[PDB]
Homo-oligomer: A and B are copies of this chain.
Amino acid sequence: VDPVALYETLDRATDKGPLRPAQEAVLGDWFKNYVIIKLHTGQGKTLIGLLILQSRLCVYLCPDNFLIEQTCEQASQFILVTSVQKLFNGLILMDDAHACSDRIRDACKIKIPKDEPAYHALFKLFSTELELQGVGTFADLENGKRDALLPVQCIFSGAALEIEPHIAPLEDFGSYARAKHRIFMSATVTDDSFLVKGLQLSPDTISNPLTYAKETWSGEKMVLIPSMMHEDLDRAKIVAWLAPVNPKLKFGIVALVPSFARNKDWGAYGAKTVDKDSVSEAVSDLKKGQYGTPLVLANRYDGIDLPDNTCRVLVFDSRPFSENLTDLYQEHCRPESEATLMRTIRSIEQGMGRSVRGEKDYSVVVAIGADLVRTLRDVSSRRYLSSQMATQIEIGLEIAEMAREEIAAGKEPLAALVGLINQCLKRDDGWKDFYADQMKKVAPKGANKEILELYSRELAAEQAYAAGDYNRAEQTIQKLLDDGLAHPDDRGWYLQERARYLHDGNRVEAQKLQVAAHR
């Protein structure tokens, strides 16, 4: 049942030709051998997925329900697909593996808020581990605010009662771990080094992505970082520019924004401030040419398809801070740690994977905020980023250089920004060929072996602490520091991690470690 040849048995629509060359190859390499099918989206990952889920003659998986009833239509234009909220139980394929890692993370955080009565039983019951330290800062959480940590496995914070381990406990999804092996998919822009934290699977075959030999470069992403062109284009200007209704544009806007408070900046101009399934409405009307109203989504940097003129402009408004509070509290506590940089970058990259879904596609991405700049400027963070991303980012940086040249030539920053968006929109060949020259810097890479190993140790520390063998966690962090894998601040923070692993043991050693970290 061979997925390179037997594709010619599909009584496909008149609009459907052969396979891509890359599909011919990757289907063959799957077939001869059988993991991350890194390909530029628009190499027909839908078709690759459905042809593996034909060669299994066993089902798809995807972020969340809104798209999946739509995506099954290609089993009509060319076993039944299903979303990931189903089929698993606690006791093949997947798609957009980091984008769906957030959905499978939020399904771990079954928090319940403090106005539901269960907290008032929880707060006194759990008190024996937290009251001994927390009363020094009981202030925000006495009023129900979320801004305070509770100094108690799972984390606890001043907001809701919160079943949230540091790693997402997605192991409570059973058959995910049990099948012989299962293919993923992921755009080549993905930093798949995060998978061992985002999806827990182990470093080895994650380091060998299935890849066409000539797999190279794709997606005309004009990734504007206008926070490195001028402060006249700092974040507040774009909201007050692209949020109004403007049906005179021939393509969709969308905006991706960090919090439900900032819906009051975009929505001040009447944008369609949807929720996590009414997005279907504004995306479908943007397909149906209703280019009038910018769709806007809070804290959903992921799991949206916007092929071709459905979006030539995505506004990536600000540096993400998660739907989950532990991932936020660590941003305060570990401000230049590897964990914080990779956790942010894994979203910064995924928050650009929406507005391109074709191989020859073109797209403005505007990604803005000086804190986002602080996260993307560092060469170490472009080391975390994929080399396709690192190149596309650096091309974005060169466009910001040309934009600063234009402004130095006296061009008003918003009129230069309109000009730049004109270049990508109107297929300006002097821009397209410039971009084609610049793309020769692209080459693919495997997952980063430096980091998969450290994260397997950190992950193993979490599981050993969970498996009743805190001693093996002590050995893991000792071995980690002896190998020198920690960043200079983590050389302090790991004493607090060790202490958290040891507060169930001899209380005094962990206490001395915390005192040694507290400074």
Whether the pair B18, A361 counts as a contact (CB closer than 8 A) is no
Whether the pair A427, B11 counts as a contact (CB closer than 8 A) is yes
A13 CB-CB contact with B under 8 Å: yes
A307 CB-CB contact with B under 8 Å: yes
A23→B213 CA distance, assembly (Å)? 24
A359→B21 CA distance, assembly (Å)? 20
**In the complex, what's the smallest C-beta–C-beta distance from A122 to chain B, in angstroms?**
48
When C-beta atoms are compared, the residue in chain B nearest to A21 turns out to be: B18
When C-beta atoms are compared, the residue in chain B nearest to A24 turns out to be: B18
Whether the pair B14, A357 counts as a contact (CB closer than 8 A) is yes
Whether the pair A42, B18 counts as a contact (CB closer than 8 A) is no
Whether the pair B18, A17 counts as a contact (CB closer than 8 A) is yes
Write out the residue numbers on chain B whose beta carbons fall within 8 Å of the beta carbon of A382.
none
Convert A6-48 into 0s and 1s, putting 1 for each residue whose CB lies closer than 8 angstroms to a CB of B: 0000111111111111000000000000000000001010000
Assembly stoichiometry (copies): 2
A291 CB-CB contact with B under 8 Å: no
A358 CB-CB contact with B under 8 Å: yes
**In the complex, what's the smallest C-beta–C-beta distance from A434 to chain B, in angstroms?**
15
A362 CB-CB contact with B under 8 Å: yes
When C-beta atoms are compared, the residue in chain B nearest to A220 turns out to be: B11
Q: A20 is contacted by which of B13, B18, B77 (Cβ under 8 Å)?
A: B18
Write out the residue numbers on chain B whose beta carbons fall within 8 Å of the beta carbon of A44.
17
Convert A337-364 into 0s and 1s, putting 1 for each residue whose CB lies closer than 8 angstroms to a CB of B: 0000000000000000000011111100
Write out the residue numbers on chain B whose beta carbons fall within 8 Å of the beta carbon of A359.
14
Whether the pair B13, A358 counts as a contact (CB closer than 8 A) is yes
Write out the residue numbers on chain B whose beta carbons fall within 8 Å of the beta carbon of A13.
307-308, 358
**In the complex, what's the smallest C-beta–C-beta distance from A11 to chain B, in angstroms?**
5
A307→B17 CA distance, assembly (Å)? 15
Write out the residue numbers on chain B whose beta carbons fall within 8 Å of the beta carbon of A360.
10-12, 16
Whether the pair A11, B357 counts as a contact (CB closer than 8 A) is no
A17→B10 CA distance, assembly (Å)? 15
Write out the residue numbers on chain B whose beta carbons fall within 8 Å of the beta carbon of A12.
358, 360
Whether the pair A17, B17 counts as a contact (CB closer than 8 A) is yes
A16→B10 CA distance, assembly (Å)? 16
A11→B358 CA distance, assembly (Å)? 10
A19→B17 CA distance, assembly (Å)? 7
When C-beta atoms are compared, the residue in chain B nearest to A358 turns out to be: B14
A185→B307 CA distance, assembly (Å)? 33
Write out the residue numbers on chain B whose beta carbons fall within 8 Å of the beta carbon of A16.
15, 17, 360
Convert A352-379 into 0s and 1s, putting 1 for each residue whose CB lies closer than 8 angstroms to a CB of B: 0000011111100000000000000000
**In the complex, what's the smallest C-beta–C-beta distance from A289 to chain B, in angstroms?**
12
A35→B10 CA distance, assembly (Å)? 32
**In the complex, what's the smallest C-beta–C-beta distance from A217 to chain B, in angstroms?**
13
When C-beta atoms are compared, the residue in chain B nearest to A74 turns out to be: B15
A77→B307 CA distance, assembly (Å)? 13
When C-beta atoms are compared, the residue in chain B nearest to A432 turns out to be: B11
A284→B466 CA distance, assembly (Å)? 63
Pick the most buried of A12, A44, A360: most chain B CB atoms within 10 A of its CB.
A360
Write out the residue numbers on chain B whose beta carbons fall within 8 Å of the beta carbon of A15.
15-16, 77
When C-beta atoms are compared, the residue in chain B nearest to A17 turns out to be: B17
Q: A362 is contacted by which of B11, B21, B42, B307 (Cβ under 8 Å)?
A: B11
When C-beta atoms are compared, the residue in chain B nearest to A310 turns out to be: B14
A-B contact pairs, 28 of them (CB 8 A): A10-B360, A11-B360, A11-B362, A11-B427, A12-B358, A12-B360, A13-B307, A13-B308, A13-B358, A14-B42, A14-B307, A14-B357, A14-B358, A14-B359, A14-B361, A15-B15, A15-B16, A15-B77, A16-B17, A16-B360, A17-B17, A17-B18, A17-B19, A17-B20, A17-B44, A18-B18, A18-B19, A18-B21
* Other A-B pairs, 4, CB within 8 Å; known A14-B358, A14-B361, A17-B17: A11-B360, A14-B308, A17-B18, A18-B20
8 closest Cβ contacts across the A-B interface?
A: A14-B358, A14-B307, A17-B17, A11-B360, A17-B20, A11-B427, A12-B360, A14-B361
